[PDB]
Design a protein around this ligand. Structure first.
Ligand SMILES: *[C@@H]1O[C@H](CO)[C@@H](O)[C@H](O)[C@H]1NC(C)=O
Ligand SMILES: *[C@@H]1O[C@H](CO)[C@@H](O)[C@H](O)[C@H]1NC(C)=O
Ligand SMILES: *[C@@H]1O[C@H](CO)[C@@H](O)[C@H](O)[C@H]1NC(C)=O
Ligand SMILES: *[C@@H]1O[C@H](CO)[C@@H](O)[C@H](O)[C@H]1NC(C)=O
Ligand SMILES: *[C@@H]1O[C@H](CO)[C@@H](O)[C@H](O)[C@H]1NC(C)=O
Ligand SMILES: *[C@@H]1O[C@H](CO)[C@@H](O)[C@H](O)[C@H]1NC(C)=O
Ligand SMILES: *[C@@H]1O[C@H](CO)[C@@H](O)[C@H](O)[C@H]1NC(C)=O
Ligand SMILES: *[C@@H]1O[C@H](CO)[C@@H](O)[C@H](O)[C@H]1NC(C)=O
Ligand SMILES: *[C@@H]1O[C@H](CO)[C@@H](O)[C@H](O)[C@H]1NC(C)=O
Ligand SMILES: *[C@@H]1O[C@H](CO)[C@@H](O)[C@H](O)[C@H]1NC(C)=O
Lengths: 225, 209, 344
């Protein structure tokens, strides 16, 4: 099958630049144009441009002139040729350039169909741009009332944070909300779990907040009062 | 350039119903594409060139249309067919449409959580209010600090559709400084919703159990 | 009664057996001599649909010109993906000759005789012939050389104009010479003289003819956004040497008509390279140093290859940049009015 694989997650200060690759396989690199699409979070899609790897011919979106450049590179191996990576360079990053960036290719099927029928999408590359810096979260308890219980994950950067209870022993009734971007530039979310009111004095509940960018792991025990 | 309208945005589809959207493009004479995107995962093409299925796609996905308007159609909606759907014309793209599971009742339940003492030692207080379910999504969560209605100092966290029971959940967090928190006593959450005969209020007094 | 079909065509030319020249030698073994009495039968009351973008005639000519270039033009060194192929590289005689394409028995080529034919629509005046007209296999980028002119007015050719990924072919009804020269004394440094007064006069008309297809808005040219030198520059071959010319001056949109003082002769900075990227799609090829003496290739510019720079054009202007890249599109420039049909 035809696969498109992109480079890892990227965070950049505003004013910086980024170079995203996109490895290809399962087809002949020369015969197909590669387009770059960013899944604009709550803006839909904005098409960036294409590159025909024959001569590296490019066509950049008018609303991105002078900030984007594309290039290609063919396979080095003699035993595995016809593959190759495509590249995206983005300069002068600001706020609106925070999105999920994809490399696409038109599915090989028909002739008349125009060069915009993306059947193949890469796994994508999440790109965040702010003045904030990598920070590990604190873990405060949302203690159960004496009359549910949870943990709120506050002041961390960047995404993501994964949430599991008792090392993954209690999964039902667990509700880990999406992160919210505070005015401070740092993220926050909330994670709760409904449990019997009788097992609040016999059962121990623990929330395993994980944050890989900061290499942080906290073991928090939520209790009444 | 070309305008692409995907009205309306969302609708409730009972498992087995049929979908029908409208891609009333600005300038016709062209074709249209369709993508299924379960958020958190990559978009999957379904229909290309106005009306044609792509590789390895179940024949429940039906596309058609002509001129300016276009239509997609799903026969017997599956458990993994609930997601987002987008249409495209060349370099110009659409906005998207969301699918949702139906029924579901009408009533929200409300827990309240005071800020921990550990957090007060940092100088900030977070009052978190917890709602489960609650369809329709039209919420009116009002904060009240000593019967002073609060606004512009709280933020919300909503959708997380569970395939097991088709339920919702919602968080509205109130953020205050250590000073302002200790300045007042009663903290309430006013959840005014259509499926509520009367607005439900959960509260607590600062310093008590 | 006939049917649109595809078959193996055969080539015909006037190649000479005594010629040491590359194209003659290929055409000697690959072609038959030109028929001395070509006949054309005008079909009355008959319309027909053509499509130069789906034409198997194009893919055959492409397959031949590859063969021609693989048989004669052999680089000293050449990559085969991960390894090198070290062959023989003697200097050759190179000057492309007209090559007719012809149909076997049972088949006939249909020709579009409509003057303002753009390539995709239906025709009113259709005739039947056995062979195409004389077509030189001139490979090049940005500009089309030694080809055919438009019957009446400048004709814009494209598979889909609203599609930016579709290359545009400008068919000129009036050609302009481009005098390329490498003087005999830095031996890599050449130049191309072009009559400036006549170029921007033609390019004035090109601009105006293009404004019809884009809602009467302003039209501005820009240098290529990127790519290999072969596509960012006017790449071509004369006398076996690979030329690369900078065409920034050729699209001086400032000097188009207007402010009025831009006449005279314009010369383009050109260089002769020995390390090129093969249009074969086979990689990089190293050739021997140039030959002694004055190398001169006086060509005719008959067409331009543009790609519309397209995004979210909120502003009232379309940006066009030169560059073909697809050498199959060079053939469509000549084969646009021909179609192979099967008889009954
Ligand atoms: C114009 O583009 C559409 C795609 O939107 C394509 O289906 C159509 O064939 C193109 N028109 C022509 C005349 O080829
Ligand atoms: C060519 O003419 C046909 C028929 O009139 C028309 O449909 C098509 O749009 C034209 N193409 C161009 C590039 O003008
Ligand atoms: C008929 O064909 C001739 C020659 O092939 C051509 O010059 C002429 O324009 C055509 N007649 C009409 C009325 O189109
Ligand atoms: C160059 O153009 C002239 C007409 O301007 C023509 O007579 C001549 O044959 C052309 N040279 C070619 C096609 O090699
Ligand atoms: C070339 O065509 C244009 C229109 O496209 C016309 O104005 C001009 O007179 C033509 N040139 C000649 C020499 O006939
Ligand atoms: C082309 O230009 C060269 C000088 O660069 C000159 O010697 C030659 O006579 C010119 N040929 C024509 C046909 O103008
Ligand atoms: C350019 O061509 C024009 C004809 O269009 C001619 O009158 C003029 O003399 C030429 N210029 C030069 C410098 O030869
Ligand atoms: C061509 O020349 C222009 C201006 O002289 C220059 O900006 C451009 O970089 C050149 N293109 C090359 C060297 O490929
Ligand atoms: C464009 O034309 C003007 C007017 O003659 C000239 O000054 C300028 O150098 C030209 N631009 C080029 C050749 O890049
Ligand atoms: C164009 O044709 C002339 C002869 O008519 C020839 O000398 C010249 O080399 C040709 N141009 C190219 C690029 O081969």
């Amino acid at each position: 099958e035809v696969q498109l694989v992109e480079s890892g997650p990227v965070m950049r200060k505003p004013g910086s630049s980024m170079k995203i690759s996109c490895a290809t396989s399962g087809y002949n690199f020369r015969d197909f144009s590669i387009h770059w699409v960013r899944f604009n979070r709550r803006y839909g899609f904005e098409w960036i441009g294409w590159i025909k790897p024959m001569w590296g011919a490019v066509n950049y979106a008018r609303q991105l002139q002078g900030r984007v450049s594309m290039s290609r590179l063919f396979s080095q191996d003699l035993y595995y040729p016809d593959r190759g990576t495509a590249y995206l360079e983005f300069s002068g990053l600001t706020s609106a350039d925070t999105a999920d960036y994809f490399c696409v290719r038109r599915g090989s099927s028909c002739p008349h169909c125009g060069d915009f029928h993306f059947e193949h999408w890469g796994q994508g590359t999440a790109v965040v741009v702010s003045a904030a810096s990598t920070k590990g979260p604190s873990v405060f308890p949302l203690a159960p009332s004496s009359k549910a219980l949870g943990c709120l994950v506050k002041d961390y950067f960047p995404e993501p944070v994964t949430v599991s209870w008792n090392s993954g022993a209690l999964t039902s009734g667990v509700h880990t909300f999406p992160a919210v971007l505070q005015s401070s530039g740092l993220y926050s979310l909330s994670s709760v779990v409904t449990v019997p009111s009788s097992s609040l004095g016999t059962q121990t509940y623990i929330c395993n907040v994980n944050h890989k960018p900061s290499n942080t792991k906290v073991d928090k025990k939520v209790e009444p009062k | 350039e070309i305008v692409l309208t995907q009205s309306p945005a969302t609708l409730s589809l009972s498992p087995g119903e049929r979908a029908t959207l409208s891609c009333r493009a600005s300038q016709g004479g062209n074709s249209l594409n369709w993508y299924q995107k379960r958020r958190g995962q990559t978009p999957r093409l379904l229909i290309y060139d106005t009306s044609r299925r792509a590789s390895d796609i179940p024949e429940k996905f039906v596309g058609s249309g002509s001129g300016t308007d276009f239509s997609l159609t799903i026969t017997k909606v599956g458990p993994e067919d609930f997601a987002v759907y987008y249409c495209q014309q060349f370099e110009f793209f659409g906005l998207g449409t969301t699918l949702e599971i139906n029924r579901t009742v009408a009533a929200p339940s409300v827990f309240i959580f005071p800020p921990s003492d550990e957090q007060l030692k940092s100088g900030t207080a977070s009052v978190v209010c917890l709602l489960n379910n609650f369809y329709p999504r039209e919420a009116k969560v009002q904060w009240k600090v000593d019967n002073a209605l609060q606004s512009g100092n709280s933020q919300e966290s909503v959708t997380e559709q569970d395939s097991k029971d088709s339920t919702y959940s919602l968080s509205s967090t109130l953020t205050l400084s250590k000073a302002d928190y200790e300045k007042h006593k009663v903290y309430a959450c006013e959840v005014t919703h259509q499926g509520l005969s009367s607005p439900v209020t959960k509260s607590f007094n600062r310093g008590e159990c | 009664v006939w049917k649109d079909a595809d078959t193996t065509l055969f080539c015909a030319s006037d190649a000479k057996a005594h010629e040491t020249e590359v194209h003659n030698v290929w055409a000697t073994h690959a072609c038959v001599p030109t028929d001395p009495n070509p006949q054309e039968i005008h079909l009355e009351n008959v319309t027909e649909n053509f499509n130069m973008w789906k034409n198997n005639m194009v893919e055959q000519m492409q397959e031949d010109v590859i063969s021609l270039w693989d048989q004669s033009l052999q680089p000293c060194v050449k990559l085969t993906g991960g390894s090198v192929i070290k062959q023989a590289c003697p200097k050759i005689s190179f000057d492309p000759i007209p090559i007719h394409y012809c149909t076997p028995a049972g088949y006939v080529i249909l020709k579009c005789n409509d003057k303002n034919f753009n390539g995709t629509g239906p025709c009113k005046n259709v005739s039947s012939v056995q062979c195409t007209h004389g077509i030189k296999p001139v490979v090049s980028t940005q500009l089309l050389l030694n080809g055919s002119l438009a019957e009446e007015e400048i004709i814009i050719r494209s598979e889909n104009l609203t599609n930016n990924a579709k290359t545009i072919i400008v068919h000129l009804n009036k050609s302009v010479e481009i005098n390329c020269t490498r003087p005999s004394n830095d031996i890599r440094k050449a130049y191309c003289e072009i009559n400036g007064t006549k170029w921007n006069k033609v390019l004035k008309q090109v601009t105006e003819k293009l404004k019809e297809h884009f809602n009467n808005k302003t039209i501005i040219f820009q240098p290529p956004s990127g790519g290999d030198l072969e596509i960012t520059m006017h790449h071509f071959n004369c006398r076996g040497e690979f030329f690369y010319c900078n065409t920034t001056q050729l699209f001086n949109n400032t000097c188009i008509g207007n402010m009025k003082g831009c006449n005279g002769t314009i010369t383009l900075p050109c260089k002769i390279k020995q390390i090129i990227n093969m249009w074969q799609g086979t990689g990089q090829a190293m050739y021997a140093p140039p030959i002694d003496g004055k190398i001169n290739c006086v060509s005719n510019i008959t067409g331009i290859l543009l790609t519309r720079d397209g995004g979210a054009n909120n502003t009232s202007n379309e940006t066009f940049r030169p560059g073909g890249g697809n050498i199959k599109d060079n053939w469509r420039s000549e084969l646009y009015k021909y179609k192979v049909v099967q008889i009954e």
